[PDB]
Amino acid sequence: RMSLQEKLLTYYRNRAAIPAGEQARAKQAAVDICAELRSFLRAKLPDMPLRDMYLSGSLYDDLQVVTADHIQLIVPLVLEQNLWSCIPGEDTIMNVPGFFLVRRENPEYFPRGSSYWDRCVVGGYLSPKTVADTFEKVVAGSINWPAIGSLLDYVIRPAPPEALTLEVQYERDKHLFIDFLPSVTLGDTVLVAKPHRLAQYDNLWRLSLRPAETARLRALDQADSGCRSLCLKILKAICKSTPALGHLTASQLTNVILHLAQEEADWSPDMLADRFLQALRGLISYLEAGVLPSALNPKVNLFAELTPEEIDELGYTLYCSLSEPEVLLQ
């Protein structure tokens, strides 16, 4: 019957690709809200050290698949270089690459109170969990979602504690989940408060990898009009659509693609099938090895948050799907 090429482009257009209308409006609803928060921050909280919150995520750069239902709103903290320093996780006793301790420097000389964020310090370290709670409470305590919603003809209601998430119904039957992501930038190190999976690492900030990864990907496709992004979206759609693959993330799949791009120059449209197969094969062998290095930061293993058992099950699921092509593609 059909070639894999056709099946994939077909799968992409009927499953991976968000319908044209829905993505514009979802994205626009997010844009509309982000702006209204810009003015709220000027008026209500000129005291809290922040910069303007801005959108980020797959929906914002057209990498979101199946449904336009989520996006991040970054909350950039202001931290003074003099007062704070970030510590690579591999240099901590935790020994976890891709994560940082954010340390409060010399309290004898910089007493508590020198930074607003000193209230979020636990044992000399800026706690990511506590920053989230404080922000959530300081926002919850000054914000008027019913009014912002009325102003934009959206209904906006926070969610149950996931208190850092907003549910935006922007049409009768459409909604969008915006979650707030507190971020810190020290030097050229960008960190986000997206907690490590295990509880014992909850004092660590996460190295933000998404911007460089997606910029890299976009630059490569731009250069040669390649299908790197198209292949990623298909994979994302499969993992999202297949429960057994729920542990796979956009970040891992993107790096699978980027590693492959180091070794395949030809990403013309007709090579899509071949690259997709290579990517599947790559992912499987990364899983077997128990290690998927970040293309942009080799020291970081993007499977390090997964247990060996989960890695093993992911590997098995994928092998099995090789002989169930029609379950993999819907």
Ligand X SMILES: Nc1nc2c(ncn2[C@@H]2O[C@H](COP(=O)(O)OP(=O)(O)O)[C@@H](O)[C@H]2O)c(=O)[nH]1
Residues of the binding site for ADP? 56, 58, 70, 208, 210, 236
Q: Is 278 within 8 Å of 260 (Cβ atoms)?
A: yes
Closer of 72 and 229 to ligand X (Cβ) = 72
Binding range to ligand X, per CB under 6 A, among 52-60, 153-161, 298-306, 320-328:
52-60
Q: How far apart, in whole angstroms, are the C-alpha atoms of residue 41 and residue 68?
A: 27
- Tally of residues, the chain: 330
| Candidate list 37, 58, 84, 97; residue touching ligand X; CB under 6 A | 58
Q: Applying CB under 6 A, which of residues 104, 175, 196, 210 lies at the interface with ligand X?
A: 210
What sign does the dihedral 101-106-110-113 (CA atoms) show? positive
Stretch of 35-43, 113-121, 203-211, 284-292 contacting ligand X, by CB under 6 A: 203-211
Q: Does 252 bind ligand X (CB under 6 A)?
A: no
Determine the straight-line distance between the first and last CA of the chain, rounded to whole angstroms.
17
Nearer to ligand X, 58 or 115 (CB): 58
| Residue number, 211 or 325, with CB nearest to ligand X | 211
Tell me the residue type at 206. Answer: R
Please tell me the distance from the alpha carbon of residue 222 to that of residue 19, in angstroms, as a whole number: 23
Smallest distance from ligand X to CB 180, Å: 10
Query: Which residues does residue 192 pair with via DSSP β-bridges, in sequence order?
Result: 183, 206
How far apart are CB 144 and ligand X at their closest, in Å?
26
**Sole window of 156-164, 205-213, 260-268, 322-330 interacting with ligand X (rule: CB under 6 A):** 205-213
- Can residue 250 be called a binding residue for ligand X (CB under 6 A)? yes
- What tokens were used for 116? 């607003």
CB atoms within 10 A of CB 184: 24
Confirm or reject binding of residue 194 to ligand X (CB under 6 A).
yes
Binder among 64, 229, 252, 255 for ligand X (CB under 6 A): 64
CB atoms within 10 A of CB 199: 7
* Cβ-contact 155, 149 below 8 angstroms: yes
User: Of these, 9, 37, 56, 136, which contacts ligand X (CB under 6 A)?
Assistant: 56
Q: Select 57 or 315, whichever has its Cβ closest to ligand X.
A: 57
| Interface of this chain with ligand X, residues 228 to 247, rule: CB under 6 A | 236
User: CB under 8 Å to 143, separation ≥6 — which residues?
Assistant: 40, 44
DSSP per-residue codes, 13-28: IIIISPPHHHHHHHHH
Nearer to ligand X, 104 or 236 (CB): 236
Q: Which is nearer to ligand X, 55 or 155 (CB)?
A: 55
> Using an 8 Å Cβ cutoff, are 255 and 263 in contact?
no
Task: Report the sign of the C-alpha dihedral through residues 295, 297, 299, 301, in that order.
Answer: negative
Smallest gap from residue 55 Cβ to ligand X (A): 8
For residue 284, give Cα distances in angstroms to 115, 271, 289, 308, 318: 47, 20, 9, 14, 7
- The site map against ligand X for 68-97 (x = CB under 6 A) is ----x-------------------------
Least Å distance between CB 182 and ligand X?
Answer: 11
Alpha carbon 303 to its chain's center? 15
Q: Per the annotation, where are the binding residues?
A: 56, 58, 70, 208, 210, 236
- Contact residues for ligand X, defined by CB under 6 A: 56-58, 64, 72, 192, 194, 206, 208, 210, 236, 250
